[PDB]
Amino acid sequence: ARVTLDYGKTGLNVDLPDDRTLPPLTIRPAPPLDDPEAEVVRCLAEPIGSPPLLDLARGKRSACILVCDITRPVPNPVLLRPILRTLHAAGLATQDILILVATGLHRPSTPAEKVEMLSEEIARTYRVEDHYGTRLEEHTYLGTTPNGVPAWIDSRYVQADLKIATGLIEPHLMAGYSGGRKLICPGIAAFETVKLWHGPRFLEHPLADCGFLEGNPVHEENTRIARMAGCDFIVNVTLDGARRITSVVAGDMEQAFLKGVAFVETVVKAAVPAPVDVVVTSSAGHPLDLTFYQAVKGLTGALPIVKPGGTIVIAAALAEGLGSPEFQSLFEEHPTLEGFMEAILKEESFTVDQWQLEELAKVRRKARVKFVSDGVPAAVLSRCHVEPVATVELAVAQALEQYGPEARVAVIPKGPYVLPVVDPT
Numbered sequence: 001a002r003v004t005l006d007y008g009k010t011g012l013n014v015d016l017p018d019d020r021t022l023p024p025l026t027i028r029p030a031p032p033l034d035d036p037e038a039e040v041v042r043c044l045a046e047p048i049g050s051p052p053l054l055d056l057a058r059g060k061r062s063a064c065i066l067v068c069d070i071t072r073p074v075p076n077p078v079l080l081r082p083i084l085r086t087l088h089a090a091g092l093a094t095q096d097i098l099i100l101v102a103t104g105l106h107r108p109s110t111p112a113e114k115v116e117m118l119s120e121e122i123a124r125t126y127r128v129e130d131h132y133g134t135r136l137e138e139h140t141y142l143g144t145t146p147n148g149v150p151a152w153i154d155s156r157y158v159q160a161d162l163k164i165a166t167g168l169i170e171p172h173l174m175a176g177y178s179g180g181r182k183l184i185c186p187g188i189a190a191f192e193t194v195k196l197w198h199g200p201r202f203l204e205h206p207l208a209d210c211g212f213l214e215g216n217p218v219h220e221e222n223t224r225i226a227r228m229a230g231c232d233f234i235v236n237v238t239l240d241g242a243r244r245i246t247s248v249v250a251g252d253m254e255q256a257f258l259k260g261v262a263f264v265e266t267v268v269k270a271a272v273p274a275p276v277d278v279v280v281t282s283s284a285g286h287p288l289d290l291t292f293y294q295a296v297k298g299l300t301g302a303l304p305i306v307k308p309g310g311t312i313v314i315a316a317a318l319a320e321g322l323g324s325p326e327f328q329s330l331f332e333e334h335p336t337l338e339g340f341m342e343a344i345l346k347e348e349s350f351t352v353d354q355w356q357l358e359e360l361a362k363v364r365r366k367a368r369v370k371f372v373s374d375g376v377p378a379a380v381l382s383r384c385h386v387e388p389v390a391t392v393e394l395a396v397a398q399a400l401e402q403y404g405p406e407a408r409v410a411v412i413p414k415g416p417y418v419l420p421v422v423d424p425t
Protein backbone atom coordinates (compact mmCIF):
# COMPACT_ATOMS: atom_id res chain seq x y z
CA ALA A 1 0.00 0.00 0.00
CA ARG A 2 1.91 3.02 -1.29
CA VAL A 3 1.05 6.39 0.26
CA THR A 4 2.59 9.86 0.15
CA LEU A 5 2.75 11.41 3.62
CA ASP A 6 2.94 15.18 3.91
CA TYR A 7 6.59 16.01 4.56
CA GLY A 8 8.38 19.32 4.12
CA LYS A 9 8.07 20.69 0.60
CA THR A 10 8.24 17.26 -1.05
CA GLY A 11 6.03 14.65 0.56
CA LEU A 12 7.45 11.28 1.59
CA ASN A 13 6.73 8.08 -0.36
CA VAL A 14 6.04 5.19 2.02
CA ASP A 15 5.06 1.57 1.33
CA LEU A 16 2.90 0.00 4.09
CA PRO A 17 1.85 -3.69 4.36
CA ASP A 18 -1.41 -4.34 2.49
CA ASP A 19 -2.49 -7.14 4.84
CA ARG A 20 -2.11 -4.97 7.97
CA THR A 21 -3.21 -1.47 6.93
CA LEU A 22 -6.65 0.18 6.80
CA PRO A 23 -7.63 2.49 3.92
CA PRO A 24 -5.99 5.90 4.44
CA LEU A 25 -7.88 8.55 6.39
CA THR A 26 -8.40 11.59 4.13
CA ILE A 27 -10.40 14.80 3.89
CA ARG A 28 -13.73 14.19 2.15
CA PRO A 29 -14.07 15.52 -1.41
CA ALA A 30 -15.68 18.90 -1.88
CA PRO A 31 -15.43 20.99 -5.05
CA PRO A 32 -12.64 23.57 -4.97
CA LEU A 33 -13.76 27.08 -5.69
CA ASP A 34 -12.74 27.82 -9.27
CA ASP A 35 -11.89 31.46 -8.48
CA PRO A 36 -11.61 31.92 -4.71
CA GLU A 37 -10.36 35.50 -5.02
CA ALA A 38 -13.47 36.43 -6.99
CA GLU A 39 -15.49 34.69 -4.29
CA VAL A 40 -13.77 36.80 -1.62
CA VAL A 41 -14.80 39.89 -3.63
CA ARG A 42 -18.42 38.68 -3.69
CA CYS A 43 -18.38 37.92 0.04
CA LEU A 44 -17.01 41.38 0.88
CA ALA A 45 -20.03 42.86 -0.92
CA GLU A 46 -22.51 40.45 0.71
CA PRO A 47 -21.03 39.25 4.02
CA ILE A 48 -22.51 37.29 6.93
CA GLY A 49 -23.86 39.33 9.83
CA SER A 50 -22.15 42.63 9.00
CA PRO A 51 -22.46 45.55 6.61
CA PRO A 52 -20.50 45.24 3.36
CA LEU A 53 -16.84 45.96 4.09
CA LEU A 54 -17.00 49.04 1.82
CA ASP A 55 -19.67 50.66 3.98
CA LEU A 56 -17.96 49.59 7.21
CA ALA A 57 -14.68 51.14 6.05
CA ARG A 58 -15.91 54.49 4.75
CA GLY A 59 -14.72 57.33 6.98
CA LYS A 60 -12.37 55.08 8.95
CA ARG A 61 -9.00 56.76 9.45
CA SER A 62 -6.81 53.72 10.08
CA ALA A 63 -7.04 49.98 9.56
CA CYS A 64 -5.18 47.02 11.01
CA ILE A 65 -5.40 43.68 9.16
CA LEU A 66 -4.34 40.61 11.13
CA VAL A 67 -2.62 37.86 9.13
CA CYS A 68 -1.28 34.50 10.21
CA ASP A 69 2.45 33.82 10.42
CA ILE A 70 4.46 31.29 8.40
CA THR A 71 3.06 28.28 10.27
CA ARG A 72 -0.37 28.64 8.62
CA PRO A 73 -0.55 28.09 4.83
CA VAL A 74 -3.09 30.86 4.26
CA PRO A 75 -3.07 31.97 0.59
CA ASN A 76 -2.98 35.52 1.85
CA PRO A 77 -2.95 37.40 -1.50
CA VAL A 78 -6.29 35.78 -2.40
CA LEU A 79 -7.84 37.26 0.77
CA LEU A 80 -5.85 40.51 0.90
CA ARG A 81 -6.15 41.88 -2.64
CA PRO A 82 -9.96 42.13 -2.29
CA ILE A 83 -9.68 43.66 1.20
CA LEU A 84 -7.06 46.17 0.08
CA ARG A 85 -9.05 47.15 -3.01
CA THR A 86 -12.19 47.70 -0.89
CA LEU A 87 -10.27 49.84 1.61
CA HIS A 88 -8.94 51.93 -1.27
CA ALA A 89 -12.49 52.30 -2.63
CA ALA A 90 -13.60 53.36 0.86
CA GLY A 91 -11.04 56.19 0.85
CA LEU A 92 -8.26 54.79 3.03
CA ALA A 93 -4.79 55.56 1.74
CA THR A 94 -2.25 52.75 1.74
CA GLN A 95 -0.32 54.43 4.56
CA ASP A 96 -3.51 54.20 6.68
CA ILE A 97 -3.38 50.38 6.48
CA LEU A 98 -1.18 48.20 8.72
CA ILE A 99 -0.74 44.47 8.15
CA LEU A 100 0.05 42.91 11.55
CA VAL A 101 1.48 39.39 11.73
CA ALA A 102 -0.46 37.58 14.48
CA THR A 103 2.44 35.50 15.81
CA GLY A 104 0.88 34.66 19.18
CA LEU A 105 3.99 33.78 21.17
CA HIS A 106 5.90 32.59 18.09
CA ARG A 107 9.08 34.27 16.95
CA PRO A 108 8.64 37.12 14.45
CA SER A 109 8.31 36.45 10.75
CA THR A 110 11.48 37.06 8.75
CA PRO A 111 11.64 39.35 5.70
CA ALA A 112 11.62 36.31 3.41
CA GLU A 113 8.66 34.80 5.26
CA LYS A 114 6.69 38.02 4.77
CA VAL A 115 7.27 37.66 1.02
CA GLU A 116 6.28 33.97 1.07
CA MET A 117 3.17 34.77 3.15
CA LEU A 118 1.96 37.96 1.45
CA SER A 119 3.67 38.11 -1.99
CA GLU A 120 6.50 40.52 -2.83
CA GLU A 121 4.25 43.27 -4.15
CA ILE A 122 1.98 43.41 -1.11
CA ALA A 123 4.91 43.06 1.31
CA ARG A 124 6.72 46.12 -0.06
CA THR A 125 3.63 48.31 -0.59
CA TYR A 126 2.02 48.21 2.89
CA ARG A 127 3.55 48.40 6.37
CA VAL A 128 3.97 44.85 7.67
CA GLU A 129 4.90 44.45 11.33
CA ASP A 130 5.14 41.58 13.80
CA HIS A 131 3.44 40.97 17.11
CA TYR A 132 5.83 40.41 20.06
CA GLY A 133 4.07 38.48 22.81
CA THR A 134 6.73 39.03 25.46
CA ARG A 135 6.67 42.85 25.09
CA LEU A 136 3.87 43.83 27.46
CA GLU A 137 4.57 47.51 26.73
CA GLU A 138 3.31 46.93 23.15
CA HIS A 139 -0.11 45.83 24.47
CA THR A 140 -3.18 47.55 25.93
CA TYR A 141 -5.14 46.20 28.89
CA LEU A 142 -8.82 45.74 28.06
CA GLY A 143 -10.15 44.12 31.24
CA THR A 144 -10.13 40.74 32.94
CA THR A 145 -12.55 37.92 32.09
CA PRO A 146 -14.91 36.37 34.67
CA ASN A 147 -12.44 33.48 34.94
CA GLY A 148 -9.56 35.77 35.82
CA VAL A 149 -7.61 36.06 32.56
CA PRO A 150 -6.43 39.63 31.87
CA ALA A 151 -6.82 40.69 28.23
CA TRP A 152 -3.67 42.36 26.89
CA ILE A 153 -3.96 43.00 23.15
CA ASP A 154 -1.51 44.58 20.72
CA SER A 155 -1.94 48.36 20.84
CA ARG A 156 -1.67 48.83 17.06
CA TYR A 157 -4.85 46.78 16.65
CA VAL A 158 -6.65 48.29 19.66
CA GLN A 159 -5.96 51.82 18.36
CA ALA A 160 -6.99 51.11 14.75
CA ASP A 161 -10.38 52.51 13.71
CA LEU A 162 -11.07 49.48 11.48
CA LYS A 163 -10.12 46.00 12.75
CA ILE A 164 -9.91 43.14 10.23
CA ALA A 165 -8.70 39.56 10.66
CA THR A 166 -7.85 36.88 8.09
CA GLY A 167 -7.16 33.21 8.59
CA LEU A 168 -7.63 29.53 7.96
CA ILE A 169 -10.05 27.09 9.61
CA GLU A 170 -8.25 23.82 10.42
CA PRO A 171 -8.43 21.50 13.45
CA HIS A 172 -6.46 22.76 16.44
CA LEU A 173 -5.22 20.66 19.36
CA MET A 174 -6.22 23.21 22.02
CA ALA A 175 -8.86 25.55 20.57
CA GLY A 176 -10.77 22.93 18.57
CA TYR A 177 -10.47 24.83 15.30
CA SER A 178 -8.19 27.66 14.19
CA GLY A 179 -9.58 30.85 12.67
CA GLY A 180 -11.94 33.65 13.60
CA ARG A 181 -11.34 34.92 17.13
CA LYS A 182 -7.99 33.12 17.40
CA LEU A 183 -6.25 35.83 15.36
CA ILE A 184 -6.88 38.09 18.38
CA CYS A 185 -6.44 35.59 21.22
CA PRO A 186 -3.67 34.52 21.16
CA GLY A 187 -2.58 35.88 17.78
CA ILE A 188 -1.99 39.41 19.11
CA ALA A 189 -2.19 38.74 22.86
CA ALA A 190 0.60 39.19 25.39
CA PHE A 191 2.25 36.41 27.38
CA GLU A 192 0.51 37.92 30.42
CA THR A 193 -2.75 36.69 28.84
CA VAL A 194 -1.49 33.60 27.01
CA LYS A 195 0.37 32.02 29.93
CA LEU A 196 -2.93 31.73 31.82
CA TRP A 197 -5.11 30.84 28.83
CA HIS A 198 -2.61 28.13 27.75
CA GLY A 199 -2.21 27.01 31.37
CA PRO A 200 -3.09 23.57 32.68
CA ARG A 201 -6.37 24.85 34.13
CA PHE A 202 -7.47 25.00 30.49
CA LEU A 203 -5.39 22.36 28.73
CA GLU A 204 -5.94 19.45 31.14
CA HIS A 205 -9.64 19.26 30.30
CA PRO A 206 -10.71 16.49 27.89
CA LEU A 207 -12.50 18.78 25.41
CA ALA A 208 -9.49 21.09 25.04
CA ASP A 209 -8.87 19.10 21.91
CA CYS A 210 -9.19 18.91 18.13
CA GLY A 211 -12.66 19.49 16.73
CA PHE A 212 -14.37 20.70 19.93
CA LEU A 213 -15.81 24.20 20.18
CA GLU A 214 -18.87 23.31 22.24
CA GLY A 215 -17.71 22.22 25.66
CA ASN A 216 -14.15 23.41 25.10
CA PRO A 217 -13.04 25.92 27.79
CA VAL A 218 -10.19 27.12 25.54
CA HIS A 219 -12.70 28.26 22.90
CA GLU A 220 -15.05 29.82 25.45
CA GLU A 221 -12.18 31.93 26.73
CA ASN A 222 -10.51 33.05 23.49
CA THR A 223 -13.94 34.03 22.17
CA ARG A 224 -14.59 36.07 25.34
CA ILE A 225 -11.20 37.80 25.05
CA ALA A 226 -11.64 38.53 21.33
CA ARG A 227 -15.05 40.06 22.12
CA MET A 228 -13.36 42.46 24.53
CA ALA A 229 -11.02 43.73 21.81
CA GLY A 230 -13.59 43.63 19.02
CA CYS A 231 -13.14 42.84 15.34
CA ASP A 232 -15.10 44.52 12.59
CA PHE A 233 -14.67 42.00 9.79
CA ILE A 234 -13.08 38.62 9.11
CA VAL A 235 -12.28 36.61 6.01
CA ASN A 236 -11.53 32.93 6.61
CA VAL A 237 -10.96 30.01 4.20
CA THR A 238 -10.84 26.22 4.31
CA LEU A 239 -8.33 24.20 2.26
CA ASP A 240 -8.50 20.67 0.90
CA GLY A 241 -5.67 18.14 1.01
CA ALA A 242 -4.10 19.66 -2.11
CA ARG A 243 -4.37 23.18 -0.61
CA ARG A 244 -7.21 24.36 -2.86
CA ILE A 245 -9.68 26.73 -1.20
CA THR A 246 -12.98 24.92 -0.66
CA SER A 247 -14.91 27.71 1.12
CA VAL A 248 -14.75 31.43 1.88
CA VAL A 249 -16.61 33.09 4.76
CA ALA A 250 -16.57 36.82 5.44
CA GLY A 251 -18.25 39.19 7.89
CA ASP A 252 -18.99 39.01 11.59
CA MET A 253 -16.14 37.50 13.62
CA GLU A 254 -18.41 34.94 15.27
CA GLN A 255 -21.10 34.27 12.64
CA ALA A 256 -18.67 33.94 9.74
CA PHE A 257 -16.31 31.71 11.72
CA LEU A 258 -19.10 29.37 12.81
CA LYS A 259 -20.33 29.08 9.22
CA GLY A 260 -16.81 28.13 8.12
CA VAL A 261 -16.56 25.58 10.94
CA ALA A 262 -19.90 24.09 9.87
CA PHE A 263 -18.43 23.62 6.41
CA VAL A 264 -15.14 22.13 7.54
CA GLU A 265 -17.03 19.67 9.78
CA THR A 266 -18.67 18.19 6.66
CA VAL A 267 -15.27 17.19 5.20
CA VAL A 268 -12.60 16.92 7.92
CA LYS A 269 -13.86 13.85 9.80
CA ALA A 270 -12.44 10.48 8.79
CA ALA A 271 -14.01 7.59 10.67
CA VAL A 272 -12.71 4.12 11.51
CA PRO A 273 -14.72 1.39 13.26
CA ALA A 274 -12.27 0.90 16.15
CA PRO A 275 -8.95 2.28 17.39
CA VAL A 276 -5.80 0.47 16.28
CA ASP A 277 -2.42 -0.33 17.77
CA VAL A 278 -0.33 1.54 15.14
CA VAL A 279 -1.18 4.93 13.64
CA VAL A 280 1.05 6.42 10.92
CA THR A 281 0.77 10.18 10.55
CA SER A 282 2.48 13.40 9.50
CA SER A 283 2.74 17.02 10.61
CA ALA A 284 0.96 18.25 7.44
CA GLY A 285 4.20 19.08 5.61
CA HIS A 286 5.41 22.59 4.93
CA PRO A 287 4.85 25.04 6.52
CA LEU A 288 3.48 23.43 9.67
CA ASP A 289 6.20 20.76 10.01
CA LEU A 290 9.09 23.25 10.32
CA THR A 291 9.59 22.49 14.04
CA PHE A 292 9.19 19.66 16.54
CA TYR A 293 7.09 22.12 18.58
CA GLN A 294 4.47 22.20 15.82
CA ALA A 295 4.84 18.51 14.89
CA VAL A 296 3.38 17.60 18.29
CA LYS A 297 0.08 18.46 16.56
CA GLY A 298 0.39 15.31 14.42
CA LEU A 299 0.77 13.28 17.61
CA THR A 300 -2.26 14.78 19.38
CA GLY A 301 -4.26 14.52 16.16
CA ALA A 302 -3.76 10.73 16.07
CA LEU A 303 -4.88 10.10 19.67
CA PRO A 304 -8.61 9.40 19.05
CA ILE A 305 -7.80 6.33 16.93
CA VAL A 306 -4.79 4.84 18.75
CA LYS A 307 -5.40 2.15 21.35
CA PRO A 308 -4.02 2.80 24.85
CA GLY A 309 -0.44 1.60 24.83
CA GLY A 310 -0.31 1.77 21.02
CA THR A 311 2.31 3.49 18.88
CA ILE A 312 2.07 6.63 16.77
CA VAL A 313 4.60 6.75 13.93
CA ILE A 314 5.06 10.31 12.64
CA ALA A 315 7.05 11.67 9.71
CA ALA A 316 7.91 15.38 9.75
CA ALA A 317 10.68 17.28 7.98
CA LEU A 318 11.56 19.59 10.93
CA ALA A 319 13.58 21.84 8.63
CA GLU A 320 13.92 24.52 11.35
CA GLY A 321 14.65 22.08 14.19
CA LEU A 322 13.10 21.78 17.64
CA GLY A 323 11.55 25.21 18.15
CA SER A 324 12.08 28.11 20.52
CA PRO A 325 14.92 28.32 23.07
CA GLU A 326 12.33 28.35 25.84
CA PHE A 327 10.62 25.20 24.54
CA GLN A 328 14.02 23.50 24.26
CA SER A 329 15.00 24.57 27.79
CA LEU A 330 12.09 22.66 29.34
CA PHE A 331 13.45 19.28 28.21
CA GLU A 332 16.78 20.14 29.82
CA GLU A 333 15.07 21.16 33.05
CA HIS A 334 12.74 18.14 33.34
CA PRO A 335 14.17 14.76 32.27
CA THR A 336 10.78 13.05 32.58
CA LEU A 337 7.38 14.20 31.38
CA GLU A 338 5.91 13.20 34.76
CA GLY A 339 8.31 15.57 36.50
CA PHE A 340 7.53 18.33 34.00
CA MET A 341 3.84 17.89 34.72
CA GLU A 342 4.37 17.97 38.49
CA ALA A 343 6.17 21.29 38.05
CA ILE A 344 3.57 23.00 35.86
CA LEU A 345 0.59 21.72 37.86
CA LYS A 346 1.88 23.85 40.75
CA GLU A 347 1.28 27.11 38.81
CA GLU A 348 4.25 28.71 40.59
CA SER A 349 5.90 29.56 37.25
CA PHE A 350 5.14 29.82 33.54
CA THR A 351 7.55 29.26 30.65
CA VAL A 352 6.92 30.27 27.05
CA ASP A 353 5.85 27.22 25.00
CA GLN A 354 5.36 24.90 28.00
CA TRP A 355 1.85 24.20 26.73
CA GLN A 356 3.22 22.10 23.85
CA LEU A 357 5.23 19.93 26.22
CA GLU A 358 2.00 19.52 28.19
CA GLU A 359 0.36 18.27 24.99
CA LEU A 360 3.27 15.90 24.34
CA ALA A 361 2.82 14.60 27.91
CA LYS A 362 -0.84 13.91 27.09
CA VAL A 363 0.25 11.94 24.01
CA ARG A 364 2.78 9.90 25.98
CA ARG A 365 0.27 8.92 28.69
CA LYS A 366 -1.58 7.04 25.92
CA ALA A 367 1.00 5.97 23.35
CA ARG A 368 4.59 5.31 22.37
CA VAL A 369 5.94 7.52 19.56
CA LYS A 370 8.33 6.61 16.74
CA PHE A 371 9.61 9.71 14.92
CA VAL A 372 10.99 9.78 11.36
CA SER A 373 12.81 12.94 10.28
CA ASP A 374 16.06 14.17 8.77
CA GLY A 375 15.72 17.68 10.18
CA VAL A 376 17.05 16.81 13.64
CA PRO A 377 19.66 14.12 14.46
CA ALA A 378 18.48 10.95 16.16
CA ALA A 379 20.35 11.75 19.37
CA VAL A 380 18.50 15.07 19.65
CA LEU A 381 15.07 13.53 19.00
CA SER A 382 15.75 10.83 21.57
CA ARG A 383 15.89 13.54 24.26
CA CYS A 384 12.40 14.74 23.26
CA HIS A 385 10.38 11.74 24.48
CA VAL A 386 10.08 10.07 21.08
CA GLU A 387 11.98 7.14 19.59
CA PRO A 388 13.83 8.17 16.40
CA VAL A 389 13.53 5.50 13.70
CA ALA A 390 15.29 5.62 10.34
CA THR A 391 12.23 5.01 8.13
CA VAL A 392 8.44 4.86 8.45
CA GLU A 393 8.46 1.37 6.94
CA LEU A 394 10.96 0.19 9.55
CA ALA A 395 9.05 1.90 12.37
CA VAL A 396 5.84 0.15 11.32
CA ALA A 397 7.64 -3.21 11.05
CA GLN A 398 9.01 -2.73 14.58
CA ALA A 399 5.60 -1.79 15.98
CA LEU A 400 3.88 -4.72 14.27
CA GLU A 401 6.46 -7.11 15.72
CA GLN A 402 5.95 -5.59 19.19
CA TYR A 403 2.13 -5.79 19.18
CA GLY A 404 1.81 -9.13 17.39
CA PRO A 405 -0.12 -10.51 14.42
CA GLU A 406 -3.54 -9.09 15.35
CA ALA A 407 -2.30 -5.48 15.26
CA ARG A 408 -3.63 -3.14 12.58
CA VAL A 409 -2.20 0.06 11.05
CA ALA A 410 -4.06 3.26 10.21
CA VAL A 411 -2.48 6.02 8.11
CA ILE A 412 -3.28 9.76 8.00
CA PRO A 413 -1.30 11.38 5.16
CA LYS A 414 -2.39 14.98 5.98
CA GLY A 415 -1.92 14.49 9.72
CA PRO A 416 -3.45 17.22 11.87
CA TYR A 417 -5.51 18.60 8.97
CA VAL A 418 -7.70 15.48 9.35
CA LEU A 419 -10.00 14.73 12.29
CA PRO A 420 -9.84 10.94 12.81
CA VAL A 421 -12.76 9.50 14.75
CA VAL A 422 -14.06 6.14 15.94
CA ASP A 423 -17.65 5.37 14.96
CA PRO A 424 -18.69 2.10 16.68
CA THR A 425 -21.83 1.92 14.53
Ligand SMILES: *C(=S)c1cc(C(=O)S)c[n+]([C@@H]2O[C@H](COP(=O)(O)O)[C@@H](O)[C@H]2O)c1
Binding pocket: 067, 068, 069, 070, 071, 072, 102, 103, 104, 105, 106, 167, 168, 172, 174, 175, 177, 178, 179, 180, 182, 183, 186, 187, 188, 194, 198
Ligand atom coordinates in the same frame (compact mmCIF):
# COMPACT_ATOMS: atom_id res chain seq x y z
C1 LIG B 1 -3.35 29.04 18.84
S1 LIG B 1 -3.48 28.54 20.39
C2 LIG B 1 -2.15 29.80 18.49
C3 LIG B 1 -1.14 29.79 19.45
C4 LIG B 1 0.02 30.50 19.17
C5 LIG B 1 1.06 30.51 20.20
O1 LIG B 1 2.14 31.05 20.04
S2 LIG B 1 0.56 29.78 21.70
C6 LIG B 1 0.13 31.24 17.99
N1 LIG B 1 -0.86 31.24 17.11
C7 LIG B 1 -0.73 32.07 15.90
O2 LIG B 1 -1.89 32.95 15.92
C8 LIG B 1 -2.43 33.11 14.58
C9 LIG B 1 -3.89 32.65 14.57
O3 LIG B 1 -3.95 31.28 15.00
P1 LIG B 1 -4.84 30.22 14.19
O4 LIG B 1 -4.71 28.96 15.11
O5 LIG B 1 -4.23 30.00 12.86
O6 LIG B 1 -6.32 30.73 14.07
C10 LIG B 1 -1.52 32.27 13.65
O7 LIG B 1 -0.51 33.11 13.08
C11 LIG B 1 -0.87 31.26 14.61
O8 LIG B 1 0.41 30.81 14.15
C12 LIG B 1 -1.99 30.56 17.33
Ligand code: NI
Binding pocket: 104, 186, 198
Ligand atom coordinates in the same frame (compact mmCIF):
# COMPACT_ATOMS: atom_id res chain seq x y z
NI1 NI C 1 -1.49 29.14 21.19
